Amino acid sequence: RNKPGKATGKGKPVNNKWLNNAGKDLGSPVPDRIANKLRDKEFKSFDDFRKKFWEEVSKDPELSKQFSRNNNDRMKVGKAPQTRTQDVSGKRRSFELHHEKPISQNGGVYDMDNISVVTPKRAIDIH
Amino acid sequence: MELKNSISDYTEAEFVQLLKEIEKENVAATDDVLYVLLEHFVKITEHPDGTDLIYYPSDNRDDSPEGIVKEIKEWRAANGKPGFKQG
C-alpha cells in the first residue's frame, strides 16, 4: 500500500491498562518495549508494519496478559484485537493505528512517536 | 458449518463447535468470514454485550468455550429466555 521504510521512535512506558485510553484524546501510545523490538527494522509498507506491531504485542508477556485468549490469537497472526462492542463503528470493530501528524502534512509513517492506538469510534470522532 | 436460527436449536456441544469455528476464522488472514460468524453469534445469543462474551470475558468466569456457554446459559435462564437444546 504505502512505501518501504524503517521504524524509528521510542514510544512510552505503559501500565496494565494500556488501551484503557484508546481513542480518548490521542488514544494509547506505542509501548517502549515494543519500539525497542521494531526500531531500525525495515518494512515494505505500513500494513506490514501493523502486522509486525501486533505480533510483537502478542509476544510481550506484560502486554498479552492484558488481552483475552481470542484477542491474543488475532494479534499472533498480525491482526488488531477486537474492541468492546460499545467502541465499534460499522465494519470497523478492531483497534486502529492512527498517525498524529497525517501523512499529508510532513509525514511520519514509521515514526512510532507519531503512531497511536485508537478505537473506531474515536478514530472517526477526532476527524 | 450449519448455522441454526435459534439458540434452542443448538445443543451445548453444538454451540461449542460454533465457537471453535469462530476461533479458527479469528486466526484467518482476513475477517470477512469471521464477521459473518460473529453477527450470527450476536443474533442468536441475544446477549446485550454481544461479542464481548468472546473477546472480553469477565474475570468471574473461565475464558474458554465452556465459560462462554456457561455465561450464556445463566443469562438466558435469569431472563426467562429459552435455553440450549437438551438433545
Coordinates of N, CA and C in Angstrom, one line a residue:
Chain A
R1 N 0.8 -1.2 0.0 CA 0.0 0.0 0.0 C 0.9 1.3 0.0
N2 N 1.5 1.5 1.1 CA 2.4 2.7 1.2 C 3.8 2.3 0.6
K3 N 4.8 3.0 1.1 CA 6.2 2.8 0.6 C 7.0 2.2 1.7
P4 N 8.1 1.5 1.3 CA 9.0 0.9 2.3 C 9.7 1.9 3.2
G5 N 10.2 1.5 4.3 CA 10.9 2.4 5.2 C 11.3 1.7 6.5
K6 N 12.0 2.4 7.4 CA 12.5 1.8 8.6 C 11.8 2.5 9.8
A7 N 11.5 1.7 10.8 CA 10.8 2.2 12.0 C 11.8 2.9 13.0
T8 N 11.2 4.0 13.5 CA 12.0 4.9 14.4 C 11.1 5.4 15.6
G9 N 11.7 5.8 16.6 CA 10.9 6.3 17.7 C 11.3 5.6 19.0
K10 N 10.6 6.0 20.1 CA 10.9 5.4 21.4 C 9.6 5.0 22.1
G11 N 8.5 5.7 21.8 CA 7.2 5.3 22.4 C 7.2 5.8 23.9
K12 N 6.4 5.1 24.7 CA 6.3 5.4 26.1 C 6.0 4.2 27.0
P13 N 6.3 4.4 28.3 CA 6.0 3.3 29.2 C 4.5 3.2 29.4
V14 N 4.0 2.0 29.6 CA 2.6 1.8 29.9 C 2.3 0.9 31.1
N15 N 1.1 1.1 31.7 CA 0.7 0.3 32.8 C 0.0 -1.0 32.3
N16 N -0.8 -1.6 33.2 CA -1.5 -2.9 32.9 C -2.9 -2.6 32.3
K17 N -3.1 -1.4 31.9 CA -4.4 -1.0 31.3 C -4.0 -0.2 30.1
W18 N -3.0 -0.6 29.3 CA -2.5 0.0 28.1 C -3.5 0.7 27.2
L19 N -4.5 0.0 26.8 CA -5.5 0.6 25.9 C -6.7 1.2 26.5
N20 N -6.7 1.3 27.8 CA -7.9 1.9 28.5 C -8.2 3.3 28.0
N21 N -7.2 4.0 27.5 CA -7.3 5.3 27.0 C -7.5 5.3 25.5
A22 N -7.5 4.2 24.9 CA -7.7 4.0 23.4 C -8.8 5.0 22.9
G23 N -8.5 5.7 21.8 CA -9.5 6.6 21.3 C -9.5 7.9 22.0
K24 N -9.9 7.9 23.3 CA -9.9 9.2 24.0 C -8.6 10.0 23.8
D25 N -8.8 11.3 23.6 CA -7.6 12.1 23.3 C -6.9 11.6 22.1
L26 N -5.7 11.2 22.2 CA -4.9 10.7 21.1 C -4.8 9.1 21.1
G27 N -5.5 8.6 22.1 CA -5.5 7.1 22.3 C -4.3 6.7 23.1
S28 N -3.9 5.4 22.9 CA -2.8 4.9 23.6 C -1.5 4.9 22.8
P29 N -0.3 5.2 23.4 CA 0.9 5.2 22.7 C 1.6 3.9 22.4
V30 N 2.6 3.9 21.7 CA 3.4 2.7 21.3 C 4.2 2.4 22.5
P31 N 4.1 1.2 23.1 CA 4.8 0.7 24.3 C 6.3 0.8 23.9
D32 N 7.2 1.3 24.9 CA 8.6 1.4 24.7 C 9.3 0.0 24.4
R33 N 8.8 -1.0 25.1 CA 9.4 -2.3 24.9 C 9.1 -2.8 23.4
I34 N 8.0 -2.3 22.9 CA 7.6 -2.7 21.5 C 8.5 -2.0 20.5
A35 N 8.7 -0.7 20.8 CA 9.5 0.1 19.9 C 10.9 -0.5 19.8
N36 N 11.5 -0.9 21.0 CA 12.8 -1.5 21.0 C 12.9 -2.7 20.2
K37 N 11.8 -3.3 19.9 CA 11.8 -4.5 19.0 C 11.6 -4.2 17.6
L38 N 11.0 -3.1 17.3 CA 10.8 -2.7 15.9 C 11.8 -1.6 15.3
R39 N 12.4 -0.9 16.2 CA 13.3 0.2 15.8 C 14.4 -0.3 14.8
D40 N 14.7 0.6 13.9 CA 15.7 0.4 12.8 C 15.3 -0.7 11.8
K41 N 14.3 -1.5 12.1 CA 13.8 -2.6 11.2 C 13.1 -2.0 10.0
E42 N 13.3 -2.6 8.9 CA 12.7 -2.1 7.6 C 11.3 -2.8 7.4
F43 N 10.4 -2.1 6.7 CA 9.1 -2.6 6.4 C 8.7 -2.3 4.9
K44 N 8.0 -3.2 4.3 CA 7.6 -3.0 2.9 C 6.4 -2.0 2.8
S45 N 5.7 -1.8 3.9 CA 4.6 -0.8 3.9 C 4.1 -0.7 5.3
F46 N 3.1 0.2 5.5 CA 2.6 0.5 6.9 C 1.8 -0.8 7.3
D47 N 1.2 -1.4 6.3 CA 0.4 -2.6 6.6 C 1.3 -3.7 7.2
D48 N 2.4 -3.9 6.6 CA 3.4 -4.9 7.0 C 3.9 -4.5 8.4
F49 N 3.9 -3.2 8.7 CA 4.3 -2.6 10.0 C 3.3 -3.0 11.0
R50 N 2.0 -2.7 10.7 CA 0.9 -3.0 11.6 C 0.9 -4.5 12.0
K51 N 1.1 -5.4 11.0 CA 1.1 -6.8 11.2 C 2.2 -7.2 12.2
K52 N 3.4 -6.6 12.0 CA 4.6 -6.9 12.8 C 4.3 -6.3 14.2
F53 N 3.6 -5.1 14.3 CA 3.3 -4.5 15.5 C 2.5 -5.4 16.5
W54 N 1.4 -5.8 16.0 CA 0.5 -6.6 16.8 C 1.2 -8.0 17.2
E55 N 2.0 -8.5 16.3 CA 2.7 -9.8 16.6 C 3.6 -9.5 17.8
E56 N 4.3 -8.4 17.8 CA 5.2 -8.1 19.0 C 4.4 -8.0 20.3
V57 N 3.2 -7.5 20.2 CA 2.4 -7.3 21.3 C 2.0 -8.7 21.9
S58 N 1.7 -9.6 21.0 CA 1.4 -11.0 21.4 C 2.6 -11.7 22.1
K59 N 3.8 -11.3 21.8 CA 5.0 -11.9 22.4 C 5.4 -11.3 23.7
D60 N 4.9 -10.1 23.9 CA 5.3 -9.4 25.2 C 4.5 -9.9 26.3
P61 N 5.0 -10.6 27.3 CA 4.3 -11.1 28.4 C 3.5 -10.1 29.2
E62 N 4.0 -8.9 29.4 CA 3.3 -7.9 30.2 C 2.2 -7.3 29.4
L63 N 2.2 -7.4 28.1 CA 1.1 -6.9 27.3 C 0.0 -7.9 26.9
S64 N 0.4 -9.1 26.5 CA -0.5 -10.1 26.1 C -1.5 -10.5 27.2
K65 N -1.0 -10.4 28.5 CA -1.8 -10.7 29.6 C -2.9 -9.8 29.8
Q66 N -2.9 -8.6 29.1 CA -4.0 -7.6 29.2 C -5.1 -7.9 28.1
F67 N -4.9 -9.0 27.4 CA -5.9 -9.4 26.4 C -6.5 -10.8 26.6
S68 N -7.7 -11.1 26.1 CA -8.3 -12.4 26.2 C -7.6 -13.3 25.3
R69 N -7.9 -14.6 25.4 CA -7.3 -15.6 24.5 C -7.6 -15.4 23.0
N70 N -8.9 -15.1 22.8 CA -9.3 -14.9 21.4 C -8.6 -13.7 20.8
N71 N -8.4 -12.6 21.6 CA -7.7 -11.5 21.1 C -6.2 -11.7 20.9
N72 N -5.6 -12.5 21.8 CA -4.2 -12.8 21.6 C -3.9 -13.6 20.3
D73 N -4.8 -14.5 20.0 CA -4.8 -15.3 18.8 C -4.8 -14.4 17.5
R74 N -5.6 -13.3 17.6 CA -5.7 -12.4 16.5 C -4.4 -11.7 16.3
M75 N -3.8 -11.1 17.4 CA -2.5 -10.4 17.3 C -1.4 -11.3 16.9
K76 N -1.4 -12.6 17.3 CA -0.4 -13.5 16.9 C -0.2 -13.7 15.4
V77 N -1.3 -13.4 14.6 CA -1.3 -13.5 13.2 C -1.2 -12.2 12.5
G78 N -0.9 -11.1 13.3 CA -0.8 -9.8 12.8 C -2.0 -9.0 12.7
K79 N -3.1 -9.5 13.2 CA -4.4 -8.7 13.2 C -4.6 -7.9 14.5
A80 N -5.3 -6.8 14.4 CA -5.5 -6.0 15.5 C -6.6 -6.6 16.4
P81 N -6.5 -6.4 17.7 CA -7.6 -7.0 18.5 C -8.9 -6.4 18.3
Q82 N -10.0 -7.1 18.7 CA -11.3 -6.6 18.5 C -11.5 -5.7 19.8
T83 N -12.3 -4.6 19.6 CA -12.6 -3.7 20.7 C -13.9 -4.1 21.3
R84 N -14.2 -3.5 22.4 CA -15.5 -3.8 23.0 C -16.6 -3.4 22.1
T85 N -17.8 -4.1 22.1 CA -18.9 -3.8 21.3 C -19.2 -2.2 21.2
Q86 N -19.3 -1.6 22.4 CA -19.6 -0.2 22.5 C -18.6 0.7 21.8
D87 N -17.5 0.2 21.4 CA -16.5 1.0 20.7 C -16.4 0.8 19.2
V88 N -17.2 -0.1 18.7 CA -17.3 -0.5 17.3 C -17.9 0.6 16.5
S89 N -17.6 0.6 15.2 CA -18.2 1.6 14.2 C -18.3 0.9 12.8
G90 N -19.5 0.3 12.6 CA -19.7 -0.3 11.3 C -18.9 -1.6 11.1
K91 N -18.2 -1.7 9.9 CA -17.4 -2.8 9.7 C -16.1 -2.8 10.5
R92 N -15.8 -1.6 11.0 CA -14.6 -1.4 11.8 C -14.9 -1.8 13.3
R93 N -14.5 -3.0 13.7 CA -14.6 -3.4 15.1 C -13.3 -3.8 15.8
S94 N -12.2 -3.3 15.3 CA -10.9 -3.6 15.9 C -10.1 -2.3 16.1
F95 N -9.1 -2.3 17.0 CA -8.3 -1.2 17.2 C -7.5 -0.8 16.0
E96 N -7.4 0.5 15.7 CA -6.8 1.1 14.5 C -5.5 1.9 14.9
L97 N -4.6 1.9 14.0 CA -3.3 2.7 14.3 C -3.5 4.1 13.6
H98 N -3.4 5.1 14.4 CA -3.6 6.5 13.9 C -2.3 7.3 13.9
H99 N -2.1 8.1 12.8 CA -0.9 9.0 12.8 C -1.3 10.4 13.3
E100 N -0.6 10.8 14.3 CA -0.9 12.1 14.9 C -0.8 13.2 13.8
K101 N 0.3 13.3 13.2 CA 0.5 14.2 12.2 C 0.4 13.5 10.9
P102 N -0.8 13.6 10.2 CA -1.2 12.9 9.0 C -0.1 12.9 7.9
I103 N 0.0 11.8 7.2 CA 1.0 11.6 6.1 C 1.0 12.8 5.2
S104 N -0.2 13.4 5.1 CA -0.4 14.5 4.2 C 0.6 15.6 4.5
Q105 N 0.5 16.2 5.7 CA 1.4 17.2 6.1 C 2.7 16.6 6.8
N106 N 3.9 17.0 6.4 CA 5.1 16.5 6.9 C 5.2 15.0 6.7
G107 N 4.5 14.2 7.5 CA 4.6 12.8 7.4 C 4.8 12.0 8.7
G108 N 5.7 11.1 8.8 CA 5.9 10.3 9.9 C 5.2 9.0 9.9
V109 N 5.5 8.3 8.8 CA 4.8 7.0 8.5 C 5.2 5.9 9.5
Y110 N 6.5 5.6 9.6 CA 7.0 4.6 10.5 C 7.6 5.1 11.8
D111 N 7.3 6.4 12.1 CA 7.7 7.0 13.3 C 6.8 6.6 14.5
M112 N 7.2 5.7 15.3 CA 6.4 5.2 16.4 C 6.0 6.3 17.4
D113 N 6.6 7.4 17.3 CA 6.2 8.5 18.2 C 5.1 9.3 17.6
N114 N 4.8 9.0 16.3 CA 3.7 9.7 15.6 C 2.6 8.7 15.4
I115 N 2.6 7.6 16.1 CA 1.7 6.5 15.9 C 1.0 6.2 17.3
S116 N -0.3 5.9 17.3 CA -1.0 5.6 18.5 C -2.2 4.6 18.2
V117 N -2.7 4.0 19.2 CA -3.8 3.1 19.1 C -5.1 3.7 19.5
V118 N -6.1 3.7 18.7 CA -7.4 4.3 19.0 C -8.5 3.4 18.6
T119 N -9.7 3.6 19.2 CA -10.9 2.8 18.9 C -11.5 3.4 17.6
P120 N -12.4 2.6 16.9 CA -13.0 3.0 15.7 C -13.9 4.3 15.9
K121 N -14.6 4.3 17.0 CA -15.5 5.4 17.3 C -14.7 6.7 17.4
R122 N -13.6 6.8 18.2 CA -12.8 8.0 18.3 C -12.0 8.3 17.1
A123 N -11.6 7.2 16.4 CA -10.8 7.3 15.2 C -11.6 8.2 14.2
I124 N -12.9 8.2 14.3 CA -13.8 9.0 13.4 C -14.0 10.3 14.1
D125 N -14.3 10.3 15.4 CA -14.5 11.5 16.1 C -13.4 12.5 15.9
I126 N -12.2 12.1 16.2 CA -11.0 13.1 16.1 C -11.0 13.7 14.7
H127 N -11.6 13.1 13.7 CA -11.7 13.6 12.4 C -13.1 14.2 12.0
Chain B
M1 N -20.0 -24.5 8.5 CA -20.9 -25.4 9.1 C -22.4 -25.0 8.9
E2 N -23.3 -25.5 9.7 CA -24.7 -25.2 9.6 C -25.1 -24.2 10.7
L3 N -25.5 -23.0 10.3 CA -25.9 -22.0 11.3 C -27.4 -22.1 11.5
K4 N -27.8 -22.5 12.8 CA -29.2 -22.6 13.1 C -29.8 -21.2 13.3
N5 N -31.1 -21.1 13.4 CA -31.7 -19.7 13.5 C -31.9 -19.4 15.0
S6 N -32.0 -20.4 15.9 CA -32.2 -20.1 17.3 C -31.3 -20.9 18.2
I7 N -31.1 -20.3 19.4 CA -30.2 -21.0 20.4 C -30.9 -22.3 20.8
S8 N -32.2 -22.4 20.8 CA -32.9 -23.6 21.1 C -32.7 -24.7 20.2
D9 N -32.1 -24.4 19.0 CA -31.8 -25.4 18.0 C -30.4 -26.1 18.3
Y10 N -29.7 -25.4 19.1 CA -28.3 -25.9 19.5 C -28.1 -26.6 20.8
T11 N -27.5 -27.8 20.7 CA -27.2 -28.5 22.0 C -26.0 -27.7 22.5
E12 N -25.6 -27.9 23.8 CA -24.5 -27.2 24.2 C -23.2 -27.5 23.5
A13 N -23.1 -28.8 23.2 CA -21.9 -29.3 22.4 C -21.8 -28.7 21.0
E14 N -23.0 -28.5 20.4 CA -23.1 -27.9 19.1 C -22.7 -26.4 19.1
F15 N -23.0 -25.7 20.2 CA -22.7 -24.3 20.3 C -21.2 -24.2 20.4
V16 N -20.5 -25.1 21.1 CA -19.1 -25.1 21.3 C -18.4 -25.2 19.9
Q17 N -19.0 -26.0 19.0 CA -18.4 -26.2 17.7 C -18.5 -24.9 16.9
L18 N -19.5 -24.1 17.2 CA -19.6 -22.8 16.5 C -18.5 -21.8 17.1
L19 N -18.2 -21.9 18.4 CA -17.2 -21.1 19.0 C -15.8 -21.5 18.4
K20 N -15.5 -22.8 18.2 CA -14.2 -23.2 17.7 C -14.1 -22.7 16.2
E21 N -15.3 -22.7 15.5 CA -15.3 -22.2 14.1 C -14.9 -20.8 14.1
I22 N -15.4 -20.0 15.1 CA -15.1 -18.6 15.2 C -13.6 -18.5 15.6
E23 N -13.1 -19.3 16.5 CA -11.7 -19.3 16.9 C -10.8 -19.5 15.7
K24 N -11.2 -20.4 14.7 CA -10.5 -20.6 13.5 C -10.4 -19.4 12.6
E25 N -11.5 -18.8 12.3 CA -11.6 -17.6 11.5 C -10.9 -16.4 12.1
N26 N -10.8 -16.4 13.4 CA -10.1 -15.4 14.2 C -8.6 -15.3 13.8
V27 N -8.0 -16.5 13.4 CA -6.6 -16.5 13.0 C -6.5 -16.5 11.5
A28 N -7.6 -16.4 10.8 CA -7.5 -16.4 9.3 C -6.9 -15.0 8.9
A29 N -6.4 -15.0 7.6 CA -5.8 -13.8 7.0 C -6.7 -12.6 7.1
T30 N -8.0 -12.8 6.9 CA -8.9 -11.6 6.9 C -10.0 -11.9 7.9
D31 N -10.9 -10.9 8.1 CA -12.0 -11.0 9.0 C -13.4 -11.1 8.3
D32 N -13.4 -11.2 6.9 CA -14.6 -11.3 6.2 C -15.6 -12.4 6.7
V33 N -15.1 -13.6 6.8 CA -15.9 -14.7 7.2 C -16.2 -14.6 8.7
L34 N -15.2 -14.2 9.5 CA -15.3 -14.0 10.9 C -16.5 -13.1 11.3
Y35 N -16.6 -12.0 10.7 CA -17.6 -11.0 11.0 C -19.0 -11.6 10.7
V36 N -19.2 -12.5 9.7 CA -20.5 -13.1 9.5 C -20.8 -14.1 10.6
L37 N -19.8 -14.8 11.1 CA -20.0 -15.7 12.2 C -20.3 -15.0 13.5
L38 N -19.6 -13.9 13.7 CA -19.8 -13.0 14.9 C -21.2 -12.4 14.9
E39 N -21.7 -12.0 13.8 CA -23.1 -11.4 13.7 C -24.1 -12.5 14.1
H40 N -23.9 -13.7 13.6 CA -24.8 -14.8 13.9 C -24.7 -15.1 15.4
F41 N -23.5 -15.1 16.0 CA -23.4 -15.4 17.4 C -24.2 -14.3 18.2
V42 N -24.1 -13.1 17.8 CA -24.8 -12.0 18.5 C -26.3 -12.1 18.3
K43 N -26.8 -12.4 17.1 CA -28.2 -12.5 16.9 C -28.9 -13.7 17.7
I44 N -28.3 -14.8 17.8 CA -28.9 -15.9 18.5 C -28.8 -15.9 20.0
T45 N -27.7 -15.4 20.5 CA -27.5 -15.3 22.0 C -28.3 -14.2 22.6
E46 N -28.5 -13.2 21.8 CA -29.3 -12.0 22.2 C -28.7 -11.3 23.4
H47 N -27.5 -11.7 23.9 CA -26.9 -11.1 25.0 C -26.5 -9.6 24.7
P48 N -26.8 -8.7 25.6 CA -26.5 -7.3 25.3 C -25.1 -6.9 25.1
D49 N -24.1 -7.7 25.6 CA -22.7 -7.4 25.4 C -22.1 -8.0 24.2
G50 N -23.0 -8.7 23.4 CA -22.6 -9.3 22.1 C -21.2 -10.0 22.1
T51 N -20.4 -9.6 21.2 CA -19.0 -10.2 21.1 C -18.1 -10.1 22.3
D52 N -18.5 -9.2 23.3 CA -17.7 -9.1 24.5 C -17.6 -10.4 25.2
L53 N -18.6 -11.2 25.1 CA -18.5 -12.5 25.8 C -17.4 -13.4 25.3
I54 N -17.0 -13.1 24.0 CA -15.9 -13.8 23.4 C -14.5 -13.1 23.6
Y55 N -14.5 -11.8 23.3 CA -13.2 -11.1 23.3 C -13.0 -10.4 24.7
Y56 N -14.0 -10.2 25.5 CA -13.8 -9.5 26.8 C -14.5 -10.3 27.9
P57 N -14.2 -11.5 28.2 CA -14.8 -12.3 29.2 C -14.6 -11.7 30.6
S58 N -15.6 -11.9 31.5 CA -15.5 -11.4 32.9 C -14.5 -12.3 33.6
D59 N -13.9 -11.7 34.7 CA -12.9 -12.4 35.4 C -13.5 -13.4 36.3
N60 N -14.8 -13.3 36.6 CA -15.5 -14.2 37.4 C -15.8 -15.6 36.7
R61 N -15.4 -15.7 35.5 CA -15.6 -17.0 34.7 C -14.4 -17.3 33.9
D62 N -14.3 -18.6 33.5 CA -13.2 -19.0 32.6 C -13.3 -18.5 31.2
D63 N -12.2 -18.0 30.7 CA -12.1 -17.5 29.3 C -11.9 -18.8 28.4
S64 N -13.0 -19.5 28.1 CA -12.9 -20.7 27.3 C -14.3 -21.0 26.7
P65 N -14.4 -21.9 25.8 CA -15.7 -22.2 25.2 C -16.7 -22.6 26.2
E66 N -16.3 -23.4 27.2 CA -17.2 -23.8 28.3 C -17.6 -22.6 29.1
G67 N -16.7 -21.7 29.3 CA -17.0 -20.5 30.1 C -18.1 -19.6 29.4
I68 N -17.9 -19.5 28.1 CA -18.9 -18.8 27.3 C -20.3 -19.4 27.4
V69 N -20.3 -20.7 27.2 CA -21.6 -21.4 27.2 C -22.2 -21.2 28.6
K70 N -21.5 -21.4 29.6 CA -22.0 -21.2 31.0 C -22.6 -19.8 31.2
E71 N -21.9 -18.7 30.8 CA -22.4 -17.4 31.0 C -23.7 -17.2 30.2
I72 N -23.8 -17.7 29.0 CA -25.0 -17.6 28.2 C -26.1 -18.3 28.8
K73 N -25.9 -19.5 29.3 CA -26.9 -20.3 30.0 C -27.5 -19.6 31.2
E74 N -26.7 -19.0 32.0 CA -27.1 -18.3 33.2 C -27.8 -17.0 32.9
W75 N -27.4 -16.2 31.8 CA -28.1 -15.0 31.5 C -29.4 -15.3 30.9
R76 N -29.5 -16.2 29.9 CA -30.8 -16.6 29.3 C -31.8 -17.1 30.4
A77 N -31.3 -18.0 31.3 CA -32.1 -18.6 32.3 C -32.7 -17.5 33.2
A78 N -31.8 -16.6 33.7 CA -32.2 -15.5 34.5 C -33.2 -14.6 33.9
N79 N -33.2 -14.5 32.6 CA -34.1 -13.6 31.8 C -35.3 -14.4 31.3
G80 N -35.5 -15.6 31.7 CA -36.6 -16.4 31.2 C -36.6 -16.7 29.7
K81 N -35.5 -16.7 29.1 CA -35.4 -17.0 27.7 C -35.1 -18.5 27.5
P82 N -35.5 -19.0 26.3 CA -35.3 -20.5 26.1 C -33.8 -20.8 26.0
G83 N -33.5 -21.9 26.6 CA -32.1 -22.3 26.6 C -31.6 -23.3 25.5
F84 N -30.4 -23.8 25.7 CA -29.9 -24.8 24.7 C -30.7 -26.0 24.6
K85 N -30.6 -26.7 23.4 CA -31.4 -27.9 23.1 C -30.9 -29.0 24.0
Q86 N -31.8 -29.7 24.8 CA -31.4 -30.7 25.7 C -30.8 -31.9 24.9
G87 N -31.1 -32.0 23.6 CA -30.6 -33.1 22.8 C -29.1 -33.3 22.9

